Design an enzyme around this catalytic site. Structure first.
Site, mmCIF file in Angstrom:
data_model
loop_
_atom_site.group_PDB
_atom_site.id
_atom_site.type_symbol
_atom_site.label_atom_id
_atom_site.label_comp_id
_atom_site.label_asym_id
_atom_site.label_seq_id
_atom_site.Cartn_x
_atom_site.Cartn_y
_atom_site.Cartn_z
ATOM 1 N N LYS A 41 13.393 16.054 -12.408
ATOM 2 C CA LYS A 41 14.376 16.276 -12.257
ATOM 3 C C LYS A 41 15.628 15.181 -11.331
ATOM 4 O O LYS A 41 15.097 14.313 -11.034
ATOM 5 C CB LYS A 41 13.970 16.958 -10.259
ATOM 6 C CG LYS A 41 15.435 17.815 -9.539
ATOM 7 C CD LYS A 41 15.138 18.613 -8.802
ATOM 8 C CE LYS A 41 15.975 19.405 -8.491
ATOM 9 N NZ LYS A 41 17.273 18.512 -6.888
ATOM 10 N N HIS A 119 19.880 26.730 -0.894
ATOM 11 C CA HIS A 119 20.575 25.377 -1.757
ATOM 12 C C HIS A 119 21.752 23.911 -1.162
ATOM 13 O O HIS A 119 22.433 24.741 -0.464
ATOM 14 C CB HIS A 119 21.046 25.850 -2.736
ATOM 15 C CG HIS A 119 20.994 26.995 -3.386
ATOM 16 N ND1 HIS A 119 19.837 27.506 -4.610
ATOM 17 C CD2 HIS A 119 21.402 28.211 -4.182
ATOM 18 C CE1 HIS A 119 20.275 28.147 -4.899
ATOM 19 N NE2 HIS A 119 20.848 28.756 -4.746
ATOM 20 N N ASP A 121 23.716 22.169 -1.744
ATOM 21 C CA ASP A 121 26.004 21.950 -2.646
ATOM 22 C C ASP A 121 25.760 19.927 -2.683
ATOM 23 O O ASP A 121 26.111 19.959 -3.188
ATOM 24 C CB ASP A 121 26.296 22.891 -2.129
ATOM 25 C CG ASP A 121 27.246 23.283 -2.876
ATOM 26 O OD1 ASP A 121 26.863 23.478 -3.668
ATOM 27 O OD2 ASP A 121 28.594 22.939 -2.260
HETATM 28 CL CL LIG Z 1 20.047 18.270 -4.150
#
Ligand SMILES: [Cl-]
Ligand SMILES: [Cl-]
Ligand SMILES: [Cl-]
Length: 124
Positions: A41, A119, A121
């Site tokens: 990632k 999430h 941001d």
């Molecule tokens: Cl992140």
């Protein structure tokens, strides 16, 4: 399938330490939160606060998200965070991350009942 709330917890919560202690923090955390399983990632932030404090952000300052959605919230207070980002030397399956510790506001997108973070941001 992992719920959105559970994925946020796995990717972004690290309530067990006050701050990153070493340059190897990101390598260790990215591996153990399973963020390097099939690919590295490229960027990921961990928040060093209680889950309750992060969840509370969903009732703090409503702000636009980068993508133009309106379900983002900015923490009133700064929080201890660590940004993890791949370095030039990173190549799957040998991922390599730079660890950058900071104390900044967090911005999260919230959804659901209960209305919780789904999430990460940005930080400011
Ligand atoms: Cl992140
Ligand atoms: Cl859940
Ligand atoms: Cl997992």
């Amino acid at each position: 399938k992992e719920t959105a709330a559970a994925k946020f917890e796995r990717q972004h919560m690290d309530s067990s330490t006050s701050a990153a202690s070493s340059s190897n923090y990101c390598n260790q955390m990215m591996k153990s939160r399973n963020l390097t399983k099939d690919r590295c990632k490229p960027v990921n932030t961990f928040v060093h606060e209680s889950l309750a404090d992060v969840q509370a952000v969903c009732s703090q300052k409503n702000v636009a998200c980068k993508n133009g959605q309106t379900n983002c919230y900015q923490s009133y207070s700064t929080m201890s965070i660590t940004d993890c980002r791949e370095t030039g030397s990173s190549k799957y399956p040998n991922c390599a991350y730079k660890t950058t510790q900071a104390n900044k506001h967090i911005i999260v997108a919230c959804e659901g009942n209960p209305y919780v973070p789904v999430h990460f941001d940005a930080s400011v």
